[PDB]
Protein backbone atom coordinates (compact mmCIF):
# COMPACT_ATOMS: atom_id res chain seq x y z
CA UNK A 1 0.00 0.00 0.00
CA UNK A 2 2.49 2.46 -1.04
CA UNK A 3 1.96 6.13 -1.11
CA UNK A 4 2.07 8.95 -3.40
CA UNK A 5 5.29 10.44 -3.67
CA UNK A 6 6.52 13.91 -4.67
CA UNK A 7 3.50 15.34 -3.71
CA UNK A 8 3.88 19.09 -3.14
CA UNK A 9 2.74 20.36 0.21
CA UNK A 10 0.47 22.95 -0.43
CA UNK A 11 -1.51 20.02 -2.25
CA UNK A 12 -1.70 18.93 1.39
CA UNK A 13 -3.13 22.40 2.50
CA UNK A 14 -6.50 24.31 1.72
CA UNK A 15 -4.35 26.99 -0.11
CA UNK A 16 -7.89 28.91 -0.65
CA UNK A 17 -8.27 30.34 3.06
CA UNK A 18 -5.11 32.63 2.03
CA UNK A 19 -7.87 34.21 -0.02
CA UNK A 20 -5.34 35.78 -2.88
CA UNK A 21 -4.28 32.29 -3.31
CA UNK A 22 -6.05 29.94 -5.53
CA UNK A 23 -5.52 26.06 -6.07
CA UNK A 24 -7.47 24.20 -9.51
CA UNK A 25 -6.66 22.18 -11.28
CA UNK A 26 -7.58 21.05 -14.99
CA UNK A 27 -8.07 17.71 -16.36
CA UNK A 28 -5.68 17.08 -19.57
CA UNK A 29 -7.13 17.62 -22.84
CA UNK A 30 -6.48 15.21 -25.46
CA UNK A 31 -5.00 17.41 -28.01
CA UNK A 32 -3.15 19.56 -25.70
CA UNK A 33 0.43 19.57 -24.23
CA UNK A 34 1.17 19.47 -20.82
CA UNK A 35 2.10 22.84 -21.11
CA UNK A 36 -0.97 24.03 -22.36
CA UNK A 37 -3.46 22.19 -20.11
CA UNK A 38 -0.76 24.30 -17.45
CA UNK A 39 -2.41 27.60 -18.62
CA UNK A 40 -5.92 26.32 -18.55
CA UNK A 41 -5.44 25.01 -14.92
CA UNK A 42 -3.37 28.70 -14.04
CA UNK A 43 -6.35 30.59 -14.95
CA UNK A 44 -8.89 28.28 -13.07
CA UNK A 45 -6.43 28.96 -10.23
CA UNK A 46 -6.69 32.59 -10.80
CA UNK A 47 -10.49 32.66 -11.53
CA UNK A 48 -10.52 30.55 -7.86
CA UNK A 49 -8.39 33.58 -6.06
CA UNK A 50 -11.37 35.72 -7.20
CA UNK A 51 -13.98 33.68 -6.05
CA UNK A 52 -12.39 33.03 -2.74
CA UNK A 53 -12.27 37.02 -2.30
CA UNK A 54 -15.67 37.13 -3.04
CA UNK A 55 -16.68 34.12 -0.20
CA UNK A 56 -14.91 36.35 2.27
CA UNK A 57 -16.89 39.18 0.84
CA UNK A 58 -20.00 37.08 1.07
CA UNK A 59 -19.05 36.30 4.72
CA UNK A 60 -19.09 39.31 5.66
CA UNK A 61 -21.96 40.48 4.28
CA UNK A 62 -23.78 37.82 6.14
CA UNK A 63 -21.69 38.53 9.16
CA UNK A 64 -23.49 40.75 12.29
CA UNK A 65 -20.93 43.40 11.67
CA UNK A 66 -21.76 44.38 8.40
CA UNK A 67 -22.90 47.79 7.24
CA UNK A 68 -24.47 47.45 3.71
CA UNK A 69 -27.45 48.09 4.20
CA UNK A 70 -28.30 47.29 0.26
CA UNK A 71 -29.27 43.80 -0.75
CA UNK A 72 -27.08 41.63 -2.56
CA UNK A 73 -28.35 38.39 -4.04
CA UNK A 74 -26.78 35.07 -3.97
CA UNK A 75 -26.52 35.80 -7.95
CA UNK A 76 -25.00 39.57 -7.38
CA UNK A 77 -22.21 37.66 -5.29
CA UNK A 78 -21.65 35.35 -7.77
CA UNK A 79 -21.31 38.48 -10.33
CA UNK A 80 -18.61 40.38 -8.17
CA UNK A 81 -16.49 37.36 -9.19
CA UNK A 82 -15.80 38.83 -12.45
CA UNK A 83 -15.13 42.70 -11.83
CA UNK A 84 -12.65 41.50 -9.14
CA UNK A 85 -11.20 38.65 -11.46
CA UNK A 86 -10.95 41.61 -14.09
CA UNK A 87 -8.67 44.01 -11.56
CA UNK A 88 -6.36 40.99 -9.95
CA UNK A 89 -2.53 42.00 -10.90
CA UNK A 90 0.80 40.56 -10.52
CA UNK A 91 -0.40 36.77 -10.05
CA UNK A 92 2.58 34.50 -9.54
CA UNK A 93 2.15 30.81 -10.53
CA UNK A 94 3.06 29.28 -6.93
CA UNK A 95 3.53 25.78 -8.48
CA UNK A 96 1.95 22.84 -10.48
CA UNK A 97 1.32 19.00 -9.56
CA UNK A 98 0.48 16.47 -11.42
CA UNK A 99 -1.80 13.88 -9.83
CA UNK A 100 -0.49 10.18 -11.23
CA UNK A 101 -4.01 8.54 -11.44
CA UNK A 102 -5.78 10.69 -14.22
CA UNK A 103 -2.87 12.90 -14.92
CA UNK A 104 -4.34 15.77 -14.02
CA UNK A 105 -2.87 19.21 -13.44
CA UNK A 106 -2.92 21.74 -10.54
CA UNK A 107 -2.11 25.01 -9.75
CA UNK A 108 -1.01 26.99 -7.09
CA UNK A 109 -1.65 30.50 -7.93
CA UNK A 110 -1.23 34.46 -5.90
CA UNK A 111 -2.13 37.71 -7.10
CA UNK A 112 -0.24 40.23 -5.23
CA UNK A 113 -2.37 43.16 -5.74
CA UNK A 114 -5.23 44.70 -7.89
CA UNK A 115 -6.14 47.67 -9.80
CA UNK A 116 -8.70 50.12 -6.95
CA UNK A 117 -10.05 51.43 -10.14
CA UNK A 118 -10.56 48.59 -11.90
CA UNK A 119 -12.48 47.13 -9.24
CA UNK A 120 -14.38 49.58 -8.31
CA UNK A 121 -15.22 50.79 -11.87
CA UNK A 122 -16.80 46.82 -12.06
CA UNK A 123 -18.45 47.02 -8.80
CA UNK A 124 -20.15 50.19 -10.00
CA UNK A 125 -21.69 48.99 -13.35
CA UNK A 126 -23.59 45.73 -11.21
CA UNK A 127 -25.74 47.95 -9.51
CA UNK A 128 -24.41 48.43 -6.14
CA UNK A 129 -24.75 51.58 -3.91
CA UNK A 130 -21.70 54.35 -3.57
CA UNK A 131 -21.92 53.11 -0.31
CA UNK A 132 -21.33 49.30 -0.79
CA UNK A 133 -18.72 49.80 -3.65
CA UNK A 134 -16.91 51.53 -0.39
CA UNK A 135 -17.34 49.41 1.86
CA UNK A 136 -16.49 46.53 -0.84
CA UNK A 137 -13.66 48.03 -1.99
CA UNK A 138 -12.20 48.69 0.92
CA UNK A 139 -12.25 44.94 1.94
CA UNK A 140 -10.61 43.45 -0.57
CA UNK A 141 -7.99 46.18 -0.25
CA UNK A 142 -7.96 45.37 3.54
CA UNK A 143 -7.68 41.73 2.54
CA UNK A 144 -4.73 42.36 0.24
CA UNK A 145 -2.41 44.24 2.72
CA UNK A 146 -3.57 41.96 4.82
CA UNK A 147 -1.93 39.05 3.34
CA UNK A 148 1.92 39.47 3.64
CA UNK B 1 -4.77 24.91 6.90
CA UNK B 2 -3.98 20.96 6.48
CA UNK B 3 -7.08 19.18 4.83
CA UNK B 4 -8.36 17.28 7.44
CA UNK B 5 -10.55 14.07 6.13
CA UNK B 6 -8.45 13.14 3.10
CA UNK B 7 -9.16 9.36 2.33
CA UNK B 8 -5.83 7.22 2.73
CA UNK B 9 -6.56 6.29 -0.72
CA UNK B 10 -6.57 9.98 -2.18
CA UNK B 11 -2.86 9.88 -1.19
CA UNK B 12 -2.07 6.65 -3.22
CA UNK B 13 -1.58 5.90 -6.49
CA UNK B 14 -4.78 3.47 -6.87
CA UNK B 15 -4.41 3.23 -10.35
CA UNK B 16 -1.64 0.95 -10.05
CA UNK B 17 -4.25 -1.67 -9.13
CA UNK B 18 -5.27 -1.64 -12.73
CA UNK B 19 -8.95 -2.89 -11.75
CA UNK B 20 -9.20 0.14 -9.33
CA UNK B 21 -9.13 3.97 -11.13
CA UNK B 22 -10.00 7.66 -9.51
CA UNK B 23 -11.01 10.45 -11.44
CA UNK B 24 -12.77 13.61 -10.67
CA UNK B 25 -15.12 15.95 -11.93
CA UNK B 26 -15.51 19.62 -11.41
CA UNK B 27 -18.50 21.41 -9.40
CA UNK B 28 -20.78 22.90 -12.19
CA UNK B 29 -24.10 24.83 -11.95
CA UNK B 30 -27.35 23.42 -12.22
CA UNK B 31 -25.47 19.88 -11.25
CA UNK B 32 -25.76 19.13 -7.48
CA UNK B 33 -22.99 16.99 -5.64
CA UNK B 34 -24.82 14.18 -5.76
CA UNK B 35 -24.66 14.03 -9.71
CA UNK B 36 -20.89 15.25 -10.01
CA UNK B 37 -20.99 12.61 -8.01
CA UNK B 38 -22.11 10.41 -10.54
CA UNK B 39 -20.16 11.97 -13.20
CA UNK B 40 -16.84 11.39 -11.55
CA UNK B 41 -17.44 7.97 -11.20
CA UNK B 42 -18.05 7.39 -14.40
CA UNK B 43 -14.48 9.32 -15.03
CA UNK B 44 -13.25 6.63 -12.78
CA UNK B 45 -14.97 3.97 -14.39
CA UNK B 46 -13.15 4.79 -17.44
CA UNK B 47 -9.24 5.05 -15.82
CA UNK B 48 -10.17 1.40 -14.75
CA UNK B 49 -10.60 1.19 -18.92
CA UNK B 50 -7.69 3.19 -19.45
CA UNK B 51 -5.54 1.97 -17.02
CA UNK B 52 -6.31 -1.89 -18.88
CA UNK B 53 -5.60 -0.05 -21.79
CA UNK B 54 -2.28 1.10 -20.52
CA UNK B 55 -1.38 -2.40 -19.39
CA UNK B 56 -1.82 -4.37 -22.32
CA UNK B 57 0.08 -1.40 -24.48
CA UNK B 58 2.74 -2.05 -21.97
CA UNK B 59 3.22 -5.84 -22.43
CA UNK B 60 2.54 -4.86 -25.91
CA UNK B 61 5.80 -3.16 -25.71
CA UNK B 62 7.56 -5.42 -23.94
CA UNK B 63 10.01 -7.75 -24.84
CA UNK B 64 8.06 -11.19 -24.41
CA UNK B 65 5.30 -9.63 -26.51
CA UNK B 66 3.46 -12.31 -28.74
CA UNK B 67 1.79 -10.13 -31.23
CA UNK B 68 2.70 -9.81 -34.67
CA UNK B 69 0.93 -7.71 -35.53
CA UNK B 70 1.26 -3.86 -35.16
CA UNK B 71 -0.87 -1.77 -32.87
CA UNK B 72 -0.82 1.94 -33.47
CA UNK B 73 -1.18 4.24 -30.36
CA UNK B 74 -4.45 5.69 -31.97
CA UNK B 75 -5.84 1.47 -31.98
CA UNK B 76 -4.27 1.33 -28.39
CA UNK B 77 -6.36 4.56 -27.34
CA UNK B 78 -9.56 3.03 -29.34
CA UNK B 79 -9.49 -0.28 -27.65
CA UNK B 80 -10.38 1.94 -24.25
CA UNK B 81 -13.88 1.49 -25.66
CA UNK B 82 -14.74 -2.04 -26.01
CA UNK B 83 -12.50 -2.55 -22.82
CA UNK B 84 -15.03 -0.26 -20.81
CA UNK B 85 -18.21 -1.48 -22.34
CA UNK B 86 -16.88 -5.39 -21.11
CA UNK B 87 -16.55 -4.16 -17.45
CA UNK B 88 -19.23 -5.13 -15.02
CA UNK B 89 -19.32 -5.31 -10.99
CA UNK B 90 -17.58 -1.96 -11.10
CA UNK B 91 -18.62 -0.52 -7.18
CA UNK B 92 -17.79 3.12 -5.88
CA UNK B 93 -14.87 2.61 -3.26
CA UNK B 94 -15.12 6.57 -2.03
CA UNK B 95 -15.73 9.60 -2.88
CA UNK B 96 -13.55 12.45 -1.92
CA UNK B 97 -14.33 16.74 -2.13
CA UNK B 98 -11.23 18.85 -2.50
CA UNK B 99 -12.03 21.81 0.02
CA UNK B 100 -9.99 24.24 -2.50
CA UNK B 101 -11.97 24.16 -5.26
CA UNK B 102 -14.75 21.98 -4.98
CA UNK B 103 -13.42 19.10 -6.95
CA UNK B 104 -15.38 15.58 -6.63
CA UNK B 105 -13.06 12.56 -6.98
CA UNK B 106 -13.77 9.07 -6.80
CA UNK B 107 -12.56 5.82 -6.17
CA UNK B 108 -14.04 2.79 -8.22
CA UNK B 109 -12.92 -0.96 -8.58
CA UNK B 110 -14.02 -2.81 -11.21
CA UNK B 111 -14.75 -6.61 -10.00
CA UNK B 112 -15.31 -7.93 -13.73
CA UNK B 113 -15.75 -7.95 -17.03
CA UNK B 114 -17.64 -9.95 -20.12
CA UNK B 115 -15.37 -12.38 -22.26
CA UNK B 116 -17.81 -12.38 -24.70
CA UNK B 117 -17.97 -8.63 -24.87
CA UNK B 118 -14.22 -7.84 -24.75
CA UNK B 119 -13.55 -10.22 -27.37
CA UNK B 120 -16.50 -8.75 -29.79
CA UNK B 121 -15.35 -5.33 -28.96
CA UNK B 122 -12.18 -6.21 -30.04
CA UNK B 123 -12.43 -8.19 -33.00
CA UNK B 124 -14.74 -4.94 -34.58
CA UNK B 125 -11.68 -2.83 -33.92
CA UNK B 126 -9.64 -4.72 -36.96
CA UNK B 127 -6.90 -6.89 -34.51
CA UNK B 128 -6.28 -10.59 -35.86
CA UNK B 129 -7.28 -13.81 -34.25
CA UNK B 130 -4.32 -14.44 -32.34
CA UNK B 131 -4.36 -10.98 -31.25
CA UNK B 132 -7.52 -11.37 -29.64
CA UNK B 133 -6.68 -14.47 -28.12
CA UNK B 134 -3.99 -12.89 -26.46
CA UNK B 135 -5.49 -9.35 -24.94
CA UNK B 136 -8.40 -11.38 -23.90
CA UNK B 137 -5.55 -13.40 -21.85
CA UNK B 138 -3.91 -10.76 -20.67
CA UNK B 139 -7.62 -8.90 -19.47
CA UNK B 140 -8.38 -12.14 -17.76
CA UNK B 141 -5.01 -12.26 -15.81
CA UNK B 142 -5.21 -8.47 -14.91
CA UNK B 143 -8.62 -9.41 -13.09
CA UNK B 144 -7.54 -12.20 -11.46
CA UNK B 145 -4.39 -11.02 -10.21
CA UNK B 146 -6.95 -8.57 -8.63
CA UNK B 147 -8.48 -10.79 -6.22
Known sequence: ?????????????????????????????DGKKTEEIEKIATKRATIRVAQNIVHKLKEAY????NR??????????????????????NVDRLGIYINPNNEEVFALVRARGFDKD???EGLHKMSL????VSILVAKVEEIFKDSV
Open 1 to 29: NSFLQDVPYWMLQNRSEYITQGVDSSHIV
Open 62 to 65: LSKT
Open 68 to 89: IKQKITNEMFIQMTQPIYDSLM
Open 118 to 120: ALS
Open 129 to 132: DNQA
